[PDB]
């Protein structure tokens, strides 16, 4: 049950405040900052579910076809009493055969790191893990297929390597 | 079991992260002057934790006498697919009598805003006591975290609080400025 818990957290907490703005965000930046023959961004949040709990810092770092392009304009609000908290939400080209195949904007939910840091060591074993990935997985799809600010505008990447996490994306983006 | 998931997603997800370098950035605005000359911040981050679970926004429409100052100059970092991720940290001057009485980097414990979220509509018999034990669940849980983590040296003050019935006879100001003074 943490998991579901957790779910909400990320719901309640993220995506409810980052998902109704998305759309104006990616429209600016198609239409003011990307370079005339650059492809468009992508318009849906790709948030990656890796199964395993495993989240880097750095998607690049994770798998270099992952380029970093650049930060959408930032979204900025009041928020749990941080005055203008900053959204720097971040661009990737995914590269096939060097050169670029999608352009979107992807992070990990934080939230998965919980469930990793409480199982990287051995209780809470690595199938208990999964079990919770699960958990969180279902039920952030049953939070946004009811969620007024989901609206085409999100895509949930969920996955257990047996791998290019570029070409687990890219099977997302090309199902749209 | 979630108010205790709840606690650990904020330590592993935020204060893990903001509090290493969060004396080092007081500690360089306040080594400005004109900075100084308005009053010197406070060295601890302090963390609202209201057990009714209500998380508004903006902390002067909480209390007026929590007037914005300033921000520290933004932390950066990459996390979790985020590039340069953004951390700007708020500071407040606390009022008593119109006057500055302290000064402080202040804001709410996020995950409460769960909690609130998931009973605030709630029609079942005993919602709101449900939820204040919760809210005290996640308060001990993360006291117990941050008294073990390598992070948390004496550079952070949790300040739980259950407001009474009566609006007028509570003043948030007033609550953090008592912790602040015990913190000196
Ligand atoms: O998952 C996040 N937040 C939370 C998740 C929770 F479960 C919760 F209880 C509270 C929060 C919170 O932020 O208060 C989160 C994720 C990405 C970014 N972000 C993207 C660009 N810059 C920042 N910001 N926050
Ligand atoms: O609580 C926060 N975050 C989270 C809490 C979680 F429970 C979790 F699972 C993930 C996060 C997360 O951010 O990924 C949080 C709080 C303050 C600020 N902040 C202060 C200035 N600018 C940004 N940022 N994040």
Same mark, same amino acid.
């Given at each position: 049950?943490?998991?579901?818990?957790?779910?909400?957290?990320?719901?309640?907490?993220?995506?409810?405040?980052?998902? !109704?703005?998305? /759309?104006?965000?990616?429209?600016?930046?198609?239409?003011?900052?990307?370079?005339?023959?650059? =492809?468009?961004?992508?318009?849906?949040?790709?948030?990656? %579910?890796?199964?395993?709990?495993?989240? !880097?810092?750095?998607?690049? @770092?994770?798998?270099?076809?992952?380029?970093? %392009? +650049?930060?959408?304009?930032?979204? #900025? =609000? +009041?928020?749990?009493?941080?005055?203008?908290?900053?959204?720097?939400?971040?661009?990737?080209?995914?590269?096939?055969?060097? /050169?670029?195949?999608? #352009?979107?904007?992807?992070?990990? $939910? #934080?939230?998965?790191?919980? %469930? *990793?840091? @409480?199982?990287?060591?051995?209780?809470?074993?690595?199938?208990?893990?999964?079990?919770?990935?699960?958990? *969180?997985?279902?039920?952030?799809? +049953?939070?946004?297929?009811?969620?007024?600010?989901?609206?085409?505008?999100?895509?949930?990447? $969920?996955?257990?390597?047996? *791998?290019?996490?570029?070409? &687990?994306?890219?099977?997302?983006?090309?199902? &749209?």
């Amino acid at each position: 049950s943490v998991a579901h818990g957790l779910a909400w957290s990320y719901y309640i907490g993220y995506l409810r405040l980052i998902l !109704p703005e998305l /759309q104006a965000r990616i429209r600016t930046y198609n239409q003011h900052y990307n370079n005339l023959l650059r =492809g468009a961004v992508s318009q849906r949040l790709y948030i990656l %579910l890796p199964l395993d709990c495993g989240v !880097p810092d750095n998607l690049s @770092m994770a798998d270099p076809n992952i380029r970093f %392009l +650049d930060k959408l304009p930032q979204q #900025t =609000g +009041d928020r749990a009493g941080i005055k203008d908290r900053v959204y720097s939400n971040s661009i990737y080209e995914l590269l096939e055969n060097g /050169q670029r195949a999608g #352009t979107c904007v992807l992070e990990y $939910a #934080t939230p998965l790191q919980t %469930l *990793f840091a @409480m199982s990287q060591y051995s209780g809470f074993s690595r199938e208990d893990r999964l079990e919770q990935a699960k958990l *969180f997985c279902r039920t952030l799809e +049953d939070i946004l297929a009811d969620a007024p600010e989901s609206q085409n505008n999100c895509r949930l990447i $969920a996955y257990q390597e047996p *791998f290019s996490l570029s070409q &687990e994306v890219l099977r997302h983006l090309r199902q &749209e």
